[PDB]
Homo-oligomer: 240 residues x 3
Amino acid sequence: SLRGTTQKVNRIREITAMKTVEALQISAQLTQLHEVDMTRVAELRKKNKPAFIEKHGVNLTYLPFFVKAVVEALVSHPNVNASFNAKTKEMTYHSSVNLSIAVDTPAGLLTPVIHDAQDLSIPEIAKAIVDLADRSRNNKLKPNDLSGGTFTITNIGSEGALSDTPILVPPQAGILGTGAIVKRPVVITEDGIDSIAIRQMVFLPLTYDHQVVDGADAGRFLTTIKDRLETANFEGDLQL
Amino acid sequence: SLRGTTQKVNRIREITAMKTVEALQISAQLTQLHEVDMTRVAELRKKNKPAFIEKHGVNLTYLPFFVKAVVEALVSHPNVNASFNAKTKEMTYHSSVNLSIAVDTPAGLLTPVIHDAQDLSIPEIAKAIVDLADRSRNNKLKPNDLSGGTFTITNIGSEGALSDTPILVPPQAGILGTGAIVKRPVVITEDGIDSIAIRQMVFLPLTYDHQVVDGADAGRFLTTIKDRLETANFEGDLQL
Amino acid sequence: SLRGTTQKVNRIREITAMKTVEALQISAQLTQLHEVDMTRVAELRKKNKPAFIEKHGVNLTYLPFFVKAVVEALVSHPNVNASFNAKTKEMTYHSSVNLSIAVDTPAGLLTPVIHDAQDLSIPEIAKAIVDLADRSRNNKLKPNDLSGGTFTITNIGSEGALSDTPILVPPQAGILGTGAIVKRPVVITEDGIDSIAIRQMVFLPLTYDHQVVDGADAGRFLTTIKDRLETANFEGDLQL
Ligand SMILES: CC(C)(COP(=O)(O)OP(=O)(O)OC[C@H]1O[C@@H](n2cnc3c(N)ncnc32)[C@H](O)[C@@H]1OP(=O)(O)O)[C@@H](O)C(=O)NCCC(=O)NCCSO
Ligand SMILES: CC(C)(COP(=O)(O)OP(=O)(O)OC[C@H]1O[C@@H](n2cnc3c(N)ncnc32)[C@H](O)[C@@H]1OP(=O)(O)O)[C@@H](O)C(=O)NCCC(=O)NCCSO
Ligand SMILES: CC(C)(COP(=O)(O)OP(=O)(O)OC[C@H]1O[C@@H](n2cnc3c(N)ncnc32)[C@H](O)[C@@H]1OP(=O)(O)O)[C@@H](O)C(=O)NCCC(=O)NCCSO
């Protein structure tokens, strides 16, 4: 029991405390928020969940769709998949997308990495997330699993949040949160008629480092992700 | 008249300027946002307002309901009612909930404290808020009224805001804002039917220090508060 | 092509990286968010767009309406059109409103200034924005165009964002973002009846420096802007 005691924090939480305090002091963080209509992805996921778990052995969640769209956008917007050397004033644009994934564990938050995520299909991403989350929760990560990330995705919606202002950790330039996907009434406009529909909506807060990305660059990057998700042409990508 | 002059700032505003600049540099602040359906609380408040002011002598606002739920959640999530000693790497989990309440005054913002708020009923909380706000506005606070807080609640909705990213002040680990409670169209899902209802909704932004609380801990804490408020089993708590 | 290279950043981006990192360390930034019903302004803009471009020579966007309301509010709330000298603890309340406007350019974000914006009509503001954006994009700004700002407006909605937490740059005390104006279902309450209407809504995030502005001051300032925009008495102001 913790109430009424003073205790040394565990090793995961000691590193998190030092890294997050320092990260804010050596970058210029801000969080831009876009809304995305996830209805088509939600319909595709519900329809294909049984066939996906039968063929690939893991449950199909929303996270592999967010990962696929974000990784494609990091290839299309290489200025976001980049790091700034504040001493030399040089930007390095990475040729791999090594995608960090935040994992909640009882001992603390861990952020393992999917290396070369740009080469992965949706089934490969789904399996990799399940593997890294299981190894994070059971003390089986190696140093290469926790280093080399070029961008991070954090599932803030897992515990119900609509949004957050996640802390990025240099040398990364961005961290995207996937808010809780919620049914909401929204306006549709088609043929000059405005009307109210029920759609599965999500907020995507992107914390970006203003040293690397300006606000309009963040918006163009998030627009690429939004359009990919809203069109939801992922049937082929599921390999079912 | 202020326009076109240069003047020394008053004592309240000098301390606020120094404390807030320093607070951000010695913590890792981020703000997670959840939405809560306040309809049942709003109905209970409207129904019982006359009996409450008759028996307890103060107007019944939303703030005592937010205080009751937050204080219960600070007891249930002792990891949030805590402080981090960055020199020793030790966490202290406080056995009292001393709840700071932000009060807007013409001379500046003051943050007096309701000590041992965990022992208070809703009528006691309502009276304590009225007392501290009156003493803040009339120069009658003592040093013990302004020290010892373990968490803060700030009514950002008083002047119309939906949300904010409030600044926490170490050694506290969290500050919760109560946004403006607004009627909104929302989706209800029951019996497999999705439908649109008008509900009194609020956003609750929580700024937390990542040295003390990870994002999933913040979400679990806010979920406890959300469920308590949405169920709205406070009839007995009003003592009417 | 950038992917797989390390290159020196351009002059605009070098200054932006240094200025934004420093700005956060010498101020106490937080972002308060209000929602505003832009339907009446959108109707007035659609109705008068052809006559405005015919008489004044520039397209009428939403930005001149936001500028007019913000500039009036900076005159009415001189405490926001101000700077803090942290060495002397003195506040200077500026007698001009020199309004910085963020401009996205291919070489990087530039923030030129509309000096003495308080003396300008909506047609003058529209022309000044077009002039400064064209000169920012074609290397024709002078040092006086980039200095002396007392507040900034940044059009975060240009690239689709609903909101952001813009970084203010001392000695300014506030930066207001104009989110994307989107049709949304909202609740109207009139004659004791609650009902759902389709309205053009916008989020206005204001980043303010807590050294200069407390949360309730930010709310009162944003309320003045919200009421001016929602009433939308700008017909005369268009000079058509
Ligand atoms: C210079 C400027 C501010 C001018 O903005 P503007 O006055 O809105 O002009 P514009 O870009 O020509 O407007 C194009 C259209 O978009 C509309 N629009 C622009 N902003 C909008 C918003 N927030 N919501 C809805 N519509 C918007 C305009 O009304 C105009 O509509 P029509 O074609 O139907 O008349 C803009 O070009 C720009 O650079 N914006 C980006 C600022 C920036 O980079 N900020 C940094 C933080 S994030 O971007
Ligand atoms: C490892 C992982 C990211 C995996 O997430 P995941 O791929 O969504 O898997 P999961 O937790 O098994 O998903 C459980 C269910 O919730 C759903 N879900 C998860 N996130 C969701 C979201 N943002 N919106 C809606 N539904 C969501 C999944 O689709 C799945 O649904 P079904 O049971 O109907 O198929 C997650 O367990 C986790 O640790 N999240 C927290 C991350 C964190 O702590 N971040 C720090 C900042 S705040 O939390
Ligand atoms: C001291 C206090 C917190 C007390 O707040 P309170 O308990 O809500 O009392 P109040 O101001 O008398 O309430 C007036 C009315 O507004 C309502 N109200 C207050 N906050 C509300 C909110 N978030 N949403 C909806 N209604 C609200 C109350 O319920 C009450 O309604 P009725 O008159 O219908 O009964 C407040 O006066 C204050 O100072 N708030 C500002 C705090 C501040 O400056 N924070 C800094 C960050 S931004 O403001």
